[PDB]
Symmetry: D2
Subunit: 288 residues, 4 copies
């Protein structure tokens, strides 16, 4: 009897969605954590069947969405959330959306979960290059994109079965330089990729939980479109031109590998950056 | 209905067998390629029921062994087999056992296959360390345990459908040094992990076929015992003491990962070393 | 005519000192940036000849200390420094010790410098393990240990000659897990190691400056003693027991490599993590 | 007063020569080991002044060539040289040219040496890609360009002082794929980079000798021209266009790094691949 929390959703054009579709294939209950600023739009959009098409699985199954909670990766507990976001139009008429508040809500309603997905990123200044990034700007990126992963584990470790599994999405910009991947994201993902290891050790030895990370090719998600003729269009162009696998990478191409990593079928794998990127990661020089 | 060729089983105590079992679970049909030295024993042993306990699958399955063929990875085509090997006690009574000849035999009997497993390694002077390995010994190591992959691939690709997948097995002693892993075994493993990428580019672009490699943790196999209470018993103790996951590492743990990679679930992963080893590889210092 | 700024000093038992001794060997003017809280103790200690012994270079040379400035890697400009540290006993009777204020002071007095050393770390919670680290705690570590490097480059790029060179000290805890290396340091060093690359590209293409990083073995510095029978005593124990180079790693063992990296003799090397650690980094399993 | 043996010079257009020059600058004495095919030409050419322009060092130095010996890296001892090679036009008139024989010759003439350079690579089927490389071709690649290092080391160690150092040259196509780098050259390079560690452990612990390897950028050498406006001209264009450092890569750039590693300045570095390549290796995506 299986439950998965997915932290990081605001639409259906991302990897979290990809991941939720493939998990559904093996009958796993999905709990979405939506960033509060878009929680209400996402919810109204759901009710109104915008995703009814996107919720279909090959074999005549609905995606089994157990619940849909506001979730904000920038605050660990209730006592971390500041006054300005306390007023905030959007945040104001929701509650219990810190990391710890949602680890509780979920636990409260459905018991122990046993799969966890970190699928979120923010870098206020992704626009700028690493050199022109401000401290405040850089640290937000690390807080929201890297630390949040640790913070999830701490709070969710307590509501997880043993032999549970955690994942997290990463990008190659942390190993090799991609110009334009600014704001400290590259920085942020390096730490993620390393924290993944150290967590794998603490989580592995103490609770017998596994944690891994998926290094993803480029997908024209709502968030990648925000980066920028958008660098995501160029990343996909190059990738489909040059990657050893000449096909088009789909969000479920990631979903399947994730479903695998969240399953027992992978009990011997932990602390791994796993590359799901049509093989681009292995190339040095272009063919032309 | 998929068919897979596993190159290099001698007994039910290896990773090959582990991979055989887990594939069977997913209902894929098994062609075993066996080293002539041990062909007749394996065959005799199999007939006498000795493997019957070992062919038990959890959900009351047997094992779909489609065939058991003599096979030797040193010989590419028939004009390679030297007059001595040709005439040897073991080799004289057997036929069609070069890489090309079994690629043909299998094709005639069962048509194009879609999965290919490389689970053999060999090295004359394995007991001698790198410095004291002869040229003859080292090139032999590489020939048997590295090149056989490139050759398996040259010949087998033409009897494989597109979207098919190929995996091999490696050891972490290619990346960081474990002394006692001699005779150029480290060298061959490092070659095989590089070969794995170059081939992922050629096979990827030209056949839309994927190739990957599992860097496995330590197992008490027949051939791991051969290294000179032995180095493998020490390895298994270290792993079970110092690895993030303190569970005993089972060949079916590798088995199920190999299964995953050979399936369509892994359609966007290629050219990668995947570690299946309880996460030992992430450790720098023993905590104790 | 050569000048080097070294950001991160409070005594003579660290790597910055090691680095300053070896640079002196090739007649490079040294400018120390001391953390304000210990600036005055360090200065009084200097005047009183505590370091007169440590200032000797093999070949009858004094270390040429051009100047000694208070320097605080946690504030980028004057407008970043808060009220509490504005009162602060220690900080209060010093001025111009932000990153930008010192890039100016130096420039003002001696012109363009042409070698830059980042040799500093802070992680408030190094005591704890990654899991038990707080957000505030983690982000301090990244701010002080990782971001500061970027911040140096931005401000110092402007007072550097072209063909200048920058370095930074790192630790293997970012690639492989060392238990006990907590507080987000591991995290911090990963980002450093990656920022080093991305900076190498921006700095390389724009100003023709090189930037590299030195991955150091363990040294019983004043700061390592603070970590903890102190994990630094254990790190050295293991290292001297097991590293391929059986000798004792000295702070100048690092100093020489740094002097090399800061010289023109290395004009083709950039964005590199360079391991100066008696070779420990390359080992998997112990000998026993 | 140090002596170094450079294995593999054919002309003044390679990295060997570059390494020869930079060493000379540091006043170390040069023993050249030359491949018999080109021995007589090199020698004749040298006598006729043709290299005199090329032997200019900046600070009005010449070059301290202590000796120029015939040398062939395929033959370990004299009982290896087959009757055919023994009798060949080029090989018949020359003597003491196996790895052991020159290790002896040099010892008799000049006593124990302290520096050792490995700047040779060779591969029969370099023009064919990995998939289409024969077993014969590949093992030949490995024999010549990989094993010769392990053998140079077995024999030369006993005519080397402790604290001595050994370097070899590699290409980045061992890590990420550059197609056109065939015949198993990628494979040999990957072996050599693994060999480099295993040997750093054996030589480190048993002789207190260091071994490292320079992964060089592209140079218009004689042997780089041989690969089939050629692949190397494309390589040089890519490097000079897309690398962080847009300066033209010169063999003396490698030269001076090799010098550094062979000196005591690098006493704490061993088993490493050091990249000397204008930082190209850090790039994932071309910015343009
Ligand atoms: N698509 C790609 O090109 C690509 C490639 C490689 C890796 N990735 C990674 O995959 C992951 C998913 O990104 P995506 O591409 O699916 O785009 P996306 O827009 O679906 O993902 C970003 C999501 O995170 C949310 N978010 C931001 N801050 C948050 C916070 N504090 N709390 C809760 N939610 C928050 C956003 O609202 C959004 O829903 C990211 O970590 C990204 O770094 C993406
Ligand atoms: N066992 C371990 O502890 C371990 C750990 C990590 C990696 N690996 C790797 O996994 C793979 C399989 O390991 P294993 O322990 O299961 O080995 P194993 O005990 O199954 O023996 C390998 C098999 O290959 C066969 N073989 C040898 N030479 C051959 C040739 N020329 N042609 C055809 N067949 C040949 C042998 O008869 C043997 O049955 C190897 O590549 C090994 O490097 C093993
Ligand atoms: N010795 C080792 O065991 C070892 C090993 C590998 C790497 N390193 C790295 O080497 C570098 C130097 O450390 P060390 O071992 O020489 O110890 P150290 O005590 O000399 O270095 C820390 C110095 O940084 C200073 N500092 C802290 N925060 C600062 C700030 N905001 N502004 C200015 N200065 C500040 C401290 O006062 C201290 O002088 C560090 O980056 C460390 O991570 C050390
Ligand atoms: N040139 C480049 O663009 C480049 C780039 C990266 C790495 N490298 C590496 O640097 C090293 C030297 O490269 P290079 O371009 O200077 O080569 P090169 O043009 O100097 O040729 C190598 C030399 O080795 C000699 N040689 C070949 N086989 C031999 C044998 N069996 N015994 C003794 N000598 C032998 C050849 O005569 C030749 O002079 C090689 O290992 C190469 O892989 C070269
Ligand atoms: O954080 C932002 N950007 C952003 C950028 C990259 C991201 O992810 C990736 C996208 C593509 C690749 Cl190829 C890799 C990625 O990791 C994500 Cl998920 C978000 N914002 C919010 C505030 O400012 C506007 C944009
Ligand atoms: O090649 C041989 N030995 C050998 C050594 C390692 C091997 O594989 C591994 C086993 C354990 C680990 Cl931990 C890693 C491995 O790679 C294999 Cl399959 C075989 N021979 C020939 C000489 O004696 C008989 C066995
Ligand atoms: O930042 C702190 N600790 C600290 C820890 C490790 C450090 O460096 C290293 C030391 C050893 C190795 Cl082996 C590696 C290192 O990177 C440094 Cl320079 C500082 N503090 C200040 C506040 O709390 C008390 C201790
Ligand atoms: O082995 C041969 N070719 C060859 C190829 C690459 C080599 O080295 C490299 C050159 C450029 C880069 Cl960019 C990388 C290299 O490693 C070397 Cl020294 C030699 N032969 C034999 C057949 O024809 C004559 C030359």
């Amino acid at each position: 009897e299986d439950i998965c929390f997915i932290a990081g959703i605001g639409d259906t054009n991302g990897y979290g969605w990809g991941i939720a579709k493939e998990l559904s294939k093996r009958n796993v209950k999905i709990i979405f954590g939506i960033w509060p600023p878009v929680y209400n739009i996402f919810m109204k959009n759901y009710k109104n069947g915008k995703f009814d098409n996107d919720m279909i699985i090959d074999k005549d199954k609905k995606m089994n969405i157990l619940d849909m909670l506001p979730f904000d990766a920038s605050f660990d507990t209730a006592n971390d959330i500041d006054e300005e976001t306390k007023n905030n139009k959007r945040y104001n008429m929701l509650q219990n959306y810190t990391i710890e508040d949602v680890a509780n809500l979920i636990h409260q309603k459905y018991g122990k979960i046993n799969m966890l997905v970190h699928s979120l990123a923010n870098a206020k200044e992704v626009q700028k290059d690493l050199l022109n990034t401000s401290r405040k700007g850089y640290l937000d990126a690390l807080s929201k994109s890297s630390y949040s992963l640790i913070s999830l584990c701490k709070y969710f470790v307590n509501i997880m079965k043993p032999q549970s599994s955690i994942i997290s999405l990463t990008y190659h910009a942390s190993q090799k330089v991609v110009p334009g991947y600014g704001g400290g994201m590259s920085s942020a993902k390096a730490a993620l990729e390393s924290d993944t290891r150290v967590l794998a050790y603490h989580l592995g030895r103490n609770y017998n939980i596994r944690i891994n990370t998926i290094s993803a090719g480029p997908l024209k998600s709502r968030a990648a479109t925000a980066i920028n003729y958008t660098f995501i269009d160029y990343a996909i162009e190059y990738s489909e031109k040059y990657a050893p696998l000449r096909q088009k990478l789909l969000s479920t191409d990631i979903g399947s590998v994730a479903s695998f990593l969240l399953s027992r079928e992978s009990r011997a794998i932990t602390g791994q950056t796993i590359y799901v990127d049509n093989g681009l990661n292995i190339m040095f020089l272009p063919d032309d």
